[PDB]
Design a protein around this ligand. Structure first.
Ligand SMILES: Cc1cc(CCCOc2c(C)cc(-c3noc(C(F)(F)F)n3)cc2C)on1
Ligand SMILES: Cc1cc(CCCOc2c(C)cc(-c3noc(C(F)(F)F)n3)cc2C)on1
Lengths: 297, 239, 194, 40, 297, 239, 40, 239
């Protein structure tokens, strides 16, 4: 294990006709990748490469803020003949699989240990009714409440589970900067697992699903409009962004090829024809001797 | 040193003369759980010779149209010998695995197998939302077959399976592959009956063939797995 | 230490629920009582100092102690076997199966109480107070009590005695991820009178 | 790193660790392969 | 008294068959909790536990911000034929019992000494009238005025008690961040008491109520809309959050089981059936030998 | 040292031979109020032998259906001896209490009492908003009875009453319990007539029983309380 | 702790005090119980 | 030290308060087989916590006319727990045994049991030349009954059984007996299925009795046996 701030330098190489030395030949059967250097495969010049590697660090590769949740509910009076339930909120059931870019990028490793910075971005639209005159978006107070595993969830906007005396909650308005906080590495294990070759229950029943991990039960995010209902219908759209920090990554995986279909498993249907079809990942060319983008003069 | 190897664990000793090397997964050898990493406070049972020895599983016929085979550890050895009994009688297990795949053919035969140790290999099923059943996932010593080896039965690629600890059996060069697996879990121990740390997969990348008088030759593939530094915690009745 | 409702049955009322009726048996090796270890679910450990305060958290780790006080006569003798079965399968109903797990054999005498240490035996560093009891993240296993010999009381002494069970955490005990306890609920702002 | 908060996990992206050991994945063999040597 | 930053380590233990040594037997009659160690009850291994205890500190357990007050009044012209009273305000009479999560959590101790950080979160809704066209929430100035014991209270929005020349008051608008301040430990005694086994008056009359403490007379919070009445009716909802700081706690109590019914006493009705019924706190199971969540295979 | 104990305060001396230990509430012994903690500036009266001595209250019959009994301090001793007179004649009091509960039965009898010293025990009433009357709360030396001992008459739990300084009388092991109470108030002194620092509670957790010829046995429960380091301030006429 | 204000009570959450004495509640007995000893 | 004893082996812990002492058979404690005494050259499996722990067998009703009971070791534990599995899976075994016999009765009851550890106890049958059948000799965990306890079922004498490591359960003095057995064989290891080193025998010398209201009392006898320093050699398939 050596320090690599810049890519390897190239050393000047000479003609070499030596018996018993075959640097260009390797045995792939050992499981070892070819160790052949350019210096010993061709005649090379001295090159002092000052290309930096900091952008290919797993901290930089995974430590960008990615969307992990998009939920939209109608902000209005949901009350009817006999309901008494205001329903101006949503519950998510925390996960990192709903959006494929962060999922496929996280799924390039088996295990990840990171503290996560979260950013919530709310947006309002007036609901296009029969008689609706627009004149501006109310500066509503929102409450995002993390309900951990085994805590009572809210059933209404007006519920008293919103007390949040011990539940972590953040209050933030529409016209303010998007809410932000850091959640620590909060697994019962020493790393998060993107794949579980097993079951999360002690029973052998169908109801006990394959792939579900007994460390991904992370609880729920409950987000409400704190303001009581307006005289008109609004649509609140909430976007939650995840930025992994202080990242450790283990056991790199084969990248996902087929499009995801759900968040409970890694099943696939594949696309009808190449690319990313079950029988053809790379698009077809005419023959093994055909260059599809051959430069013609 | 050479292309010859003898593996000796307890009662067991395997010899090969057409070897390539020993693949130590992530350049690590299995070791016993230290105190700094220990969770379960009860004194563990460390049966060396009775568990840490080569268990040979039932062989598989390499066919011209063979898609490939996988064995999930420790599920493959959970109903075999004293490793099985210690699993049945304990809540928690920890062990590495020395896996040794064997395949004999003539100098006139051609064919290549990729032998992959995949950690936390979650099987994806083609053309359904329904996740794989207990039966499909837990096949024990008999192991399972690849339906989509091209996709590693994961919606991933066979192409990129070389990230994983692997060797090849190329009948030109090699009749045997050897992969040393260390403990691979986010936790120090686990429940053997409901989670598999590793999946040993044997995929034919180049098919088995011969010339005019070496076609339809009976060529089996034998797998021998040795638990390494096996530990058990939570002594109870047998499950 | 805090008392457990081991007798949480739909025939016991009030203080009846905190004592276990132990009797002389016309049989041998028989199971006397069970204790679920699902702190998150409605069980004997819920309404304990361990339960109520741990139930303000989501994650927990460490060994538990469960102390049983025998409350019969000075003249009444007996030997019990209390067993902690780590999780994986069903709760034991035969003493031959229970004895194979972590257990203590209890001889009644001048020392009126016995402790069984429920030792920290889990793959993960922490367990979760989860609504799914059968989850690998949540399940602790089983505590079961069988007759080792029998309860023997002379004619002058009552045949039907009682056992009181207490549970506490040891010094290796930890809680994380604070939450609003589900023990207490509210439908409205509490008024001055009503 | 800077961190204006009490907890250490609240801190910004961690100081760049440029340590590389690709041998874990590229040459994970018991007996090391020598450059130029027939690796049989 | 020792320092505990991490939970106790486990030491390796051997077989022990020694006469006169019975570490698993205790006398519960002494009032002392069992002193039996795992090391001396079973055969243990060496474990170096690095689990932290900082999250179970009473500073962390009580020092979260909890809701302590929710009051809503109508912001409009309350004037009539002959009233001349604007009534666009409320008075609370400070306490910490109206909301059960902070009450039950505080009531786990007999005595508490803490300085308290307060955060006020206001919210507006347009009142759903017969003819009401919404177009946005006015940025109103609010005044929260602490009226200490024995000071004149305001009777109207337009009262001159709002002078606040010596009364502590905070002015804060709707579209600003929620108002915040720290109230010091302000008891006539050395700690706050969650329970008073006694009376707060020298007389023996019925009017002198049991449980009322002569140190919980903390005065009142009076909150007003500073802005004069709008042409339309608004509903202002105010939420007050309490965060104990610099906390000392004494004499831990048996946790509350029955649901609270009022803020003047600790009386109960209990729920009709288990759980938390007067005769059954824990839910019923079939028998003492029945496992309700028994794992079946 | 053993299972035997003699308590000697002033005129008084109590001996027991079936003891367990002495419970020092929160590991503290009562002491006189120091100058650093003093508020009332008048010189206090410290009558040692005349007040700091065992006052034996009226006994209670332990029945098969006994719910339990409580005594509120200092209310229990406010109309008894020189402790009462000093209370009647002074505005402020401070004292600890050495409480000693006594219950004799045979080796053939079975039964268990929890003896709890509960600080600031605010009695909650079942099925009403009306708070407990002066009569219900202030019963003096006669003490009160538990209606809901399961809930500690607080909407709390008997189960979790072991937070509080406590002992047991288990007729197998013990005939007497002893709890040393120090001063428990947010203030250094208080008004005895309108506030009780402590509540000594005796709850039968396991009922009193015998076999064939030891049923319906007359078994009383006797309580002896000794004020410890008693102080009085605000000498006035008697109330 | 930091505190940008004049008063000391205005300061943030106090520096973690990890002192524990559970003996106050777990072994509040005049004569201490010895581990392994018959405590009668 | 006293009449109280706690035995702790692995998961297991037994406590007694009416003990006599611990009988170390021939003043020796079980130890692992040394190299100077070793015969079998294969590395042995030493499972400490999983085998060296108290296995409680099925109880026996002490009757007025009870002749007595015996359990042959290791036959009693050969189909129980991980000790059984290691026996079933290995040719050779070596272990000592910590035997603990339990019997509770009242202070009004009378009766005495001799608890004898007899080495190489060859059962003699009365009134026949035919030697005892496999069934009669190998009864496992259920154990056997004495037909002629007076003759130790050997044509010897119960009288002279005190040569053998022994204790008594005299209900006046004792409710439990404890005998530590070391390895007793002319060879360092043996085949568990076809030879028993020890026979634990429980013989009533004085019958179980009571007075007027303590007759026909249900008094079981419980036996708990802990293998000590268990070793196994000759790892094969299970028999
Ligand atoms: C797999 C996997 C899962 C994770 C952690 C994801 C973090 O989950 C969240 C998210 C996305 C948001 C909040 C959150 N947002 O707001 C709040 C608050 F308001 F309660 F503070 N909490 C909390 C958690 C644990 O990391 N890997
Ligand atoms: C019991 C008990 C009671 C307490 C103290 C509670 C703090 O009470 C308050 C609250 C909740 C708010 C304010 C307050 N809010 O705003 C203002 C201001 F505007 F006047 F500054 N004061 C003042 C006090 C004393 O702590 N324990």
């Amino acid at each position: 294990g050596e320090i690599v701030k810049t890519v390897a330098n190239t050393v000047e190489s000479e003609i070499k006709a030596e018996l018993g030395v075959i640097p260009s030949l390797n045995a792939v059967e050992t499981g070892a990748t070819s160790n052949t250097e350019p210096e010993e495969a061709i005649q090379t010049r001295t090159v002092i490469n000052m290309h930096g590697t900091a952008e290919c660090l797993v901290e930089n590769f995974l430590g960008r803020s990615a969307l992990v949740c998009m939920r939209s509910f109608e902000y209005k009076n949901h009350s009817t003949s006999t309901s008494s339930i205001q329903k101006n909120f949503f519950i998510w059931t925390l996960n990192t699989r709903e959006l494929v870019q962060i999922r496929r990028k996280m799924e390039l490793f088996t295990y990840l240990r990171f503290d996560t910075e979260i950013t919530i971005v709310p947006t309002l639209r007036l609901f296009s009714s029969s008689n609706v005159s627009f004149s501006g978006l109310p500066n509503l107070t929102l409450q995002a409440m993390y309900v951990p595993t085994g805590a009572r969830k809210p059933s209404s906007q007006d519920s008293f589970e919103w007390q949040s005396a011990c539940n972590p909650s953040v209050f933030f308005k529409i016209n303010d900067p998007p809410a932000r906080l850091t959640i620590p590495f909060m697994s019962i294990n020493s790393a998060y697992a993107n794949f579980y070759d097993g079951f999360a229950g002690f029973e052998k029943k169908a109801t006990v699903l394959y792939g579900i991990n007994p460390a991904n039960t992370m609880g729920n995010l409950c987000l409400r409009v704190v303001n009581s209902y307006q005289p008109v219908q609004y649509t609140l759209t909430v976007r939650v962004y995840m930025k992994p920090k202080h990242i450790k990554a283990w056991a790199p995986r084969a990248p996902r090829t087929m499009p995801y279909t759900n968040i409970l498993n890694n099943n696939y249907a594949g696309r009808s024809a190449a690319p990313n079809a079950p029988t053809a990942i790379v698009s077809h060319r005419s023959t093994i001797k055909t260059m599809p983008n051959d430069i013609n003069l | 040193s050479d292309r010859v190897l003898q593996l000796k664990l307890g009662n067991s000793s395997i010899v090969t003369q057409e070897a390539a090397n020993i693949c130590c997964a992530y350049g690590e050898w299995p070791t016993y759980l230290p105190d700094n990493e220990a969770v379960a406070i009860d004194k563990p049972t460390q049966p060396e010779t009775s568990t840490d020895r080569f268990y040979t599983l039932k062989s598989k016929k390499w066919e011209s149209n063979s898609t490939g085979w996988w064995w999930k550890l420790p599920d493959a050895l959970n109903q075999i010998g004293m490793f099985g009994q210690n699993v049945q009688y304990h809540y928690l297990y920890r062990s590495g695995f020395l896996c040794h795949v064997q395949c004999n053919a003539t100098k006139f035969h051609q064919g290549t197998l990729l032998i992959v140790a995949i950690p936390e290999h979650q099987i994806g099923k083609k053309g359904t939302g329904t996740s794989a059943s207990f039966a499909e996932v837990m096949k024990g010593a008999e192991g399972g077959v690849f339906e989509q080896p091209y996709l590693l039965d994961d919606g991933t690629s066979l192409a990129c399976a070389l990230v994983y600890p692997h060797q090849w059996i190329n009948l030109r060069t090699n009749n045997s592959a050897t992969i040393v697996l260390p403990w691979m879990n986010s936790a120090p121990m686990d429940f053997a009956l409901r989670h598999n740390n590793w999946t040993l997969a044997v995929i034919p990348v180049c098919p088995l063939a011969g010339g005019t008088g070496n076609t339809n030759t009976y060529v089996p593939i034998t797998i021998s797995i040795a638990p390494m530094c096996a530990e058990y915690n939570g002594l109870r009745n047998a499950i | 230490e805090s008392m457990m409702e081991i007798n949480n049955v739909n025939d016991a009322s009030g203080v009846e629920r905190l004592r276990v009726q132990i009797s002389a048996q016309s049989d041998m090796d028989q199971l006397l009582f069970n204790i679920p270890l699902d702190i998150q679910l409605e069980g004997p450990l819920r309404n304990t100092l361990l339960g109520n305060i741990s139930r303000y958290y989501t994650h927990w780790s460490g060994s538990l102690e469960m102390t049983f006080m025998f409350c019969g006569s000075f003249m009444t003798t007996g030997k019990l076997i209390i067993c902690y079965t780590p999780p994986g399968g069903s709760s034991p109903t035969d003493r031959m199966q229970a004895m194979l797990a972590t257990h203590v054999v209890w001889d009644f005498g001048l020392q009126s109480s016995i402790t069984i240490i429920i030792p920290w035996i889990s793959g993960s560093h922490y367990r979760m107070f989860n609504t799914d009891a059968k989850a690998i993240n949540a399940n602790v296993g089983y505590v079961t009590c069988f007759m080792q010999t029998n309860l023997v009381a002379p004619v002058g002494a009552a045949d039907q005695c009682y056992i009181v069970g207490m549970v506490a955490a040891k010094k290796d005990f930890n809680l994380r991820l604070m939450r609003d306890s589900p023990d207490i609920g509210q439908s409205a702002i509490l008024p001055e009178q009503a | 790193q800077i961190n204006f908060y009490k907890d250490s996990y609240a801190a910004s992206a961690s100081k760049q660790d440029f340590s590389q050991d690709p041998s874990k994945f590229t040459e994970p063999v018991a007996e090391a392969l020598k450059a130029g040597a027939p690796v049989l």
